[PDB]
Design a protein around this ligand. Structure first.
Ligand SMILES: O=c1[nH]c(=O)n([C@H]2C[C@H](O)[C@@H](COP(=O)(O)OP(=O)(O)OP(=O)(O)O)O2)cc1F
Ligand SMILES: [Ca+2]
Ligand SMILES: [Ca+2]
Length: 424
DNA sequence: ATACTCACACT
DNA sequence: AGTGTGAG
């Protein structure tokens, strides 16, 4: 089990929200700029940042006022606001564009609003046969980096050198060499990527490997507007100094405990442990997944799902803004059920499916976790009023206030979610 | 208080 | 069912 069965790619929309607004407003193209939401507070929090703006140190979670301190010629687009909260329609819609083009080439998994995994095992098999036996022109990979290769002084210099090496050592006669499949996979991704940009104007990076995690790690190595092949053979040296926290799902607490317990720092340092040990420290499934991953093996399938599994509407009310009156909780649930209803009706008409479960979650001042309480009822009709009232019914009892007009403790968050979808 | 999203595991 | 993690 060498984990070279599949060709898997993870494509990612370079500063997606910023590209979207930059396509709409040319006055913003190729400048330092960024997208924000809610300009009243500290100029708005920063959700996406161009690569010009990034050369000045500007990042996500920055206030725009703090970003302007680092970059005074930084341009700003603000997220649409509808009904008192941020409306993301524009960006969901722009994703839909990208995702539909990708599904022309292979079956994709929407991982996020702006990245999809692709399984190319099958597409590569087709391309191999129509390719008789001829070599792969370097010209077929004009934006592809080969990891660990080469082994000049300007960047594109070295990218040619490494691609030339890779291709030169390529065994194009054997149609089963995993390194050949990786290559063709990537040639397809150049095509796939070439079509995204011609047809949308959006640029994107991609990672090409054998499983979902490597695909994603590879994709971050050579951003923006480039794609990186990570062969199986580049993994020992890639992982030799790769920080554990850089692998998907190891950015969190689990990854932190991998580090403290075993006293290590880098993905490759896990190879020194037997599976039984890794299973003893982190569980049967984490030890197994970790044992396989330090060696570049992960079997997580690319799941066919170009479409989400839930539709969620949320607002936070930090600080003095926390809803303290019964009537207010009604008015924001009403706002929520409204964007929910309007978004759902498009989902039934665009995708032939209905939801049946309403999820209602709220946060409470003083509570430390994202959600303080989730509740659920049945969702029967796409009516804003029914939905907010029903959201209210299932949460009134949490009002600790004796008075009926107040709400204590003040609410710091309201969350609604349509789940459990079904064919219409 | 970036803030608002989504998937999935665990129980 | 709810809760919690990890990610965008
Ligand atoms: O926390 C978040 N909140 C949040 O709204 N988004 C939104 C904004 C972003 O444009 C889009 C994609 O997220 P990315 O993490 O991939 O960042 P990009 O801006 O696309 O650039 P790149 O991948 O580095 O080239 O989702 C991401 C978050 F991570
Ligand atoms: Ca992206
Ligand atoms: Ca992304």
């Amino acid at each position: 089990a060498t984990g070279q069965d599949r060709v898997v790619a993870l494509v990612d929309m370079d500063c997606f929200f910023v590209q979207v607004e930059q396509r709409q407003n040319p006055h913003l193209r190729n400048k330092p700029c960024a997208v924000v939401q809610y300009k009243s507070w500290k100029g708005g929090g920063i959700i996406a940042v161009s690569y010009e703006a990034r050369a000045f140190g500007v990042t996500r979670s920055m206030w725009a006022d703090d970003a302007k301190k680092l970059c005074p010629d930084l341009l700003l687009a603000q997220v649409r606001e509808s009904r008192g909260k941020a409306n993301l329609t524009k960006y969901r819609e722009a994703s839909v564009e990208v995702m539909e083009i990708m599904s022309r080439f292979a079956v994709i998994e929407r991982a996020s609003i702006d990245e999809a995994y692709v399984d190319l095992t099958s597409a590569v098999q087709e391309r191999l046969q129509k390719l008789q036996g001829q070599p792969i022109s370097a010209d077929l990979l004009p934006s592809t980096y080969i990891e660990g290769l080469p082994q000049t002084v300007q960047k594109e210099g070295m990218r040619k050198q490494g691609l030339f090496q890779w291709l030169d050592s390529l065994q194009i006669d054997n149609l089963t060499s995993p390194d050949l499949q990786l290559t063709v996979g990537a040639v397809i991704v150049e095509e796939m990527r070439a079509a995204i940009e011609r047809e949308t104007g959006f640029q994107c990076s991609a990672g090409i490997s054998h499983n979902k995690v490597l695909a994603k790690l590879a994709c971050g190595l050579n951003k923006p507007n480039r794609q990186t092949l990570v062969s199986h053979g580049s993994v020992p040296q890639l992982f030799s100094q790769m920080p554990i926290r850089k692998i998907r799902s190891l950015g969190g607490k689990l990854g932190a405990s991998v580090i403290e317990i075993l006293g290590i720092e880098y993905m490759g340092e896990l190879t020194q442990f037997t599976e039984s040990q890794l299973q003893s420290h982190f569980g049967e499934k984490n030890g197994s997944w970790l044992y396989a991953m330090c060696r570049g093996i992960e079997h997580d399938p690319v799941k066919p799902r170009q479409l989400p599994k839930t539709i969620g509407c949320s607002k936070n009310f930090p600080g003095k803004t926390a809803l303290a009156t019964r009537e207010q909780v009604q008015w924001w649930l009403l706002q929520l059920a409204q964007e929910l209803e309007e978004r759902l009706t498009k989902d039934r008409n665009d995708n032939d499916r209905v939801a049946t479960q309403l999820v209602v979650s709220i946060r409470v001042q003083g509570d430390k976790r994202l959600s303080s309480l989730r509740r659920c009822c049945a969702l029967t009709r796409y009516d804003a009023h029914k939905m907010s009232h029903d959201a209210f019914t299932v949460i009134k009892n949490c009002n600790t206030s004796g008075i009926q007009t107040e709400w204590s403790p003040p609410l710091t968050m309201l969350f609604l979610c349509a789940t459990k979808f079904s064919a219409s």
